Write a protein that binds this DNA or RNA. Structure first.
Lengths: 65, 176, 37, 126, 128, 136, 69
RNA sequence: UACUAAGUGGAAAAGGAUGUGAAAGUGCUAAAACAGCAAGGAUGUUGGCUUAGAAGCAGCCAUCGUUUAAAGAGUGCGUAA
RNA sequence: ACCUCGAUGUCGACUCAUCUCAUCCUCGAGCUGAAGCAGGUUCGAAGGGUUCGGCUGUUCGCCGAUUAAAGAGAUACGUG
């Protein structure tokens, strides 16, 4: 819910619920290990690059000021 | 409005002793001796077949008085004709409780033995090692005992763990 | 309990009672308990 | 208003006096879904499954010349089917409702304004 | 209980379709076989307690919603309900009401048509 | 800033506000108003604060008028000087309020947001508040 | 330790795993009184001590357990 | 002759007060009024959209209609559904 | 500027301290975006306790190490 989100319902591959997440790579680092922490390791996640999207102002802060 | 409400009666199951100091209702399910202090605005009548106690005076504290005395008359009547019982669940992993003679033991997060004495006029029954039933003649005393047993453990949101009142679905909090 | 000097109904079930001439509130919501109104 | 109460009582007294047949049977849980199922079954029947207060049905019945003074003191959800203009099919439907519940005792009403024992009126119905 | 808005095709990829205890394929077989008539067309799905959710289902006669969408002659989602776009007339209104003649439980032409307007004036077309 | 264009004197006698409302004794433009139960001094800073507070809660369509405006001055001596060398230098501006005087009126605004804004105004003024409506 | 029971463990694995496994032994006690192991195909072994476990002898079951055995 | 259940009396700002009387208005109403309880509470409809997945309560455009005492896109609680 | 200017002995340190609670700690208790520990919040409670050294006359302050704890204050900013 806190990382540009894909929480608009549920997607299931007829026996396994695979949820899409268009999430920036900068927010993967602690994300994946904490997801394994919270989910007790009962899931996983796949490495696929979606696309080059807009950078949020949080990263823009270091561009110029 | 609770004013001189209709309180039915069967003058064969329970007999009455209406006095200005004690009201003693007696029957096969024991006796209840309601203690009422002297100098009360209320007047008691010798009646059966839906006895009703009327108001000689009309004033706020007297109004509350009559309401509460009528409510406690209802309470004592249903107690002496039916008794009272409470039941308490205990939701835990190693929590349990059972009986020794007249004392209820407790297994809690305490690493020290916990036992509590059973008050008079009430009896405990165990059906599962955690959920207990306390049965007596007073809703007052049974609720007091239920709170006494509860006082050692409070349910918490992070896990179902505590003295459940058989109908309390508590709110949930999701940490780790 | 919340230390304040003016409390008004803030959740829909915060009803006001006076216990021993101390004004307090009762509600299901546990972030809405307070006294010394 | 109380005057409105009296004039509504008079209006429904006129309604029941005009209506020959009418059956009011107390229902636990008369359900709206199965009610409109009845409505499909009744269709354009002179009957109208309807729900109005139970005190007005006393003073309606006591103004409108139909037998029973203590038969009006029913307790609970009450709905009257005014049988007319295919009153028979209305009776069919209300007995279907009788078989749709546990067992619903005869509260009041009859086929065409002459109440008798209800061990056969349901047989006219089915 | 668990209203289901699905097409007439596959009954496998419905996550809310199998949530009351029913299994997926055990009905999906006959669902596909008997809905091949309108595969690619919507068939709403609901359910009732059978005895234990071994197997139960009920398919609903289609309300006019995909035909009501083309009644506006627009294949786009209608986030504009006060705009009268598309042509509907008493003839077309009655033709639509034929679909919902058996779909509703209150039976009369004028009231079913009033249903059609009330659901349709808010469709994205301020209907006649 | 609410600073008047010019002043003949910087060092005047403020007011005797123990008397019924000379002017602005009733709401004129809007439909409701705040009134002071009694009179007192008010600075200009708190007038600006009340104006901005009521404007933040003001709708994009509502309008508000103020009645009392800073006309008088207010002076304070430094905290090292003994009693009496002259008269010091003025610090800020003060307006007077008489008992029964109205100061704020609002219009073209919902009544609920109206009472909201009146409460906001009342919580910021030391003088005791009271609420009235446009009588005529 | 607190939180375990042999019947509870086998029930949990049977439901959530579908293991369809077979037991051989049965602990005596609930969570602290583990001082003997009922044996199913042979005789129960009574442990005379705690964290020592150096004298092991296999003594007759009192029939309150042998019937269920 | 009224009030206080505050030893107010016997000190006081802001705000809060469902403490309580009195006063002038003022809705229903022994035909059940006010509750609480016993029951329904339907229906297009998961209105249309949105994010593959949001669909009475994520949210927006609508926020209207049949049976009907009445049923609300619902009074809130429930899930990303 | 109001007693005390025909006498009011005024800093700092040592010792002796006594009192208050707007509690620094031990104590009770609620609440938490209170997994738990680790935390914050303030109601009660003053019963008790509430350091040692370097620095410049020291109060202040800084620093060192350290205690379950290294209080704010009143008493001629205590006590010739």
């Amino acid at each position: 819910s806190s990382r540009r989100g894909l929480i608009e319902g549920t997607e299931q591959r007829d026996n396994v619920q695979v949820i899409k997440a268009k999430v920036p790579l900068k927010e993967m680092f602690g994300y994946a290990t904490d997801l394994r922490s919270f989910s007790q390791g009962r899931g996983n996640y796949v490495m696929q690059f979606s696309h080059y999207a807009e950078t949020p102002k949080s990263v823009v802060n270091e561009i110029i000021a | 409005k609770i004013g001189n409400r209709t309180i039915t009666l069967d003058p064969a199951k329970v007999n009455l002793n209406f006095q200005k100091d004690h009201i003693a209702v007696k029957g096969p399910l024991g006796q209840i001796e309601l203690k009422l202090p002297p100098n009360l605005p209320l007047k008691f009548e010798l009646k059966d077949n839906n006895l009703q106690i009327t108001r000689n005076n009309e004033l706020k504290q007297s109004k509350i008085f009559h309401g509460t005395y009528n409510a406690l008359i209802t309470n004592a009547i249903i107690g002496v004709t039916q008794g009272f019982e409470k039941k308490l669940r205990l939701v835990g992993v190693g929590y349990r409780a059972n009986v020794e003679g007249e004392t209820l033991n407790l297994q809690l997060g305490y690493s020290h033995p916990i036992k509590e004495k059973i008050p008079k006029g009430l009896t405990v029954k165990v059906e599962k090692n955690t959920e207990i039933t306390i049965s007596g003649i007073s809703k007052e005393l049974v609720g007091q005992f239920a709170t006494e047993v509860r006082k050692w453990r409070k349910p918490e949101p992070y896990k179902g763990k505590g003295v459940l009142y058989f109908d309390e679905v508590i709110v949930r909090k999701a940490g780790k | 309990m919340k230390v304040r000097a003016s409390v008004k109904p803030i959740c829909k079930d915060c009803k006001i009672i006076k216990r021993h001439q101390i004004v307090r509130v009762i509600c299901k919501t546990q972030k809405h308990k307070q006294r010394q109104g | 208003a109380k005057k409105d109460k009296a004039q509504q009582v008079a209006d429904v007294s006129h309604l029941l006096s005009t209506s020959a047949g009418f059956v009011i049977f107390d229902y636990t849980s008369m359900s709206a879904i199965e009610a409109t199922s009845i409505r499909k079954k009744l269709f354009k029947n002179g009957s109208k499954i309807k729900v109005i207060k139970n005190n007005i049905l006393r003073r309606a019945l006591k103004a409108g010349k139909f037998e029973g003074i203590d038969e009006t003191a029913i307790k609970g959800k009450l709905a009257v089917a005014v049988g007319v203009n295919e009153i028979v099919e209305t009776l069919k439907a209300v007995d279907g409702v009788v078989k749709a519940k546990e067992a619903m005792n005869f509260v009041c009403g009859y086929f065409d304004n002459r109440a008798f024992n209800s061990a056969d009126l349901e047989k006219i119905a089915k | 209980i668990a209203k289901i808005n699905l097409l007439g095709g596959q009954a496998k990829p419905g996550p809310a379709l199998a949530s009351v205890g029913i299994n997926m394929g055990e009905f999906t077989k006959q669902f596909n076989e008997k809905t091949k008539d309108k595969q690619g067309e919507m068939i709403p799905c609901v359910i009732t307690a059978y005895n234990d959710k071994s197997f139960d289902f009920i398919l609903k006669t289609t309300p006019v919603s995909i035909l009501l969408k083309q009644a506006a002659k627009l294949e786009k989602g209608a986030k504009n309900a006060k705009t009268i776009v598309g042509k509907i007339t008493m003839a077309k209104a009655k033709e639509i009401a034929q679909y919902k003649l058996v779909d509703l439980n209150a039976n009369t032409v004028e009231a079913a048509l009033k249903m059609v307007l009330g659901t349709a004036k808010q469709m994205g077309i301020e209907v006649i | 800033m609410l600073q008047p264009k010019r002043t003949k004197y910087r060092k005047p006698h403020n007011v005797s506000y123990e008397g019924k409302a000379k002017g602005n004794s009733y709401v004129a433009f809007g439909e409701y108003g705040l009134v002071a139960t009694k009179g007192n001094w008010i600075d200009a800073r708190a007038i600006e604060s009340a104006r901005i507070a009521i404007s933040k809660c003001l709708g994009k369509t509502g309008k508000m008028w103020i009645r009392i405006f800073p006309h008088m001055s207010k002076t304070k001596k430094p905290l090292e000087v003994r009693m009496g060398s002259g008269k010091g230098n003025p610090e800020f501006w003060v307006a007077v309020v008489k008992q029964g005087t109205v100061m704020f009126e609002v219009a073209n605004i919902p009544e609920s947001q109206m009472i909201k804004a009146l409460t906001r105004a009342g919580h910021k003024l030391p003088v005791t508040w009271k609420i009235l409506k446009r009588e005529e | 330790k607190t939180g375990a029971n042999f019947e509870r463990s086998v029930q949990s694995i049977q439901q959530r795993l579908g293991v369809k496994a077979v037991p051989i032994q049965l602990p005596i006690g609930a969570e602290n009184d583990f001082n003997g192991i009922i044996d199913l195909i042979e005789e129960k072994v009574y442990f005379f001590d705690g964290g020592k476990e150096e004298k092991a002898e296999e003594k007759p079951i009192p029939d309150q357990f042998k019937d269920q055995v």
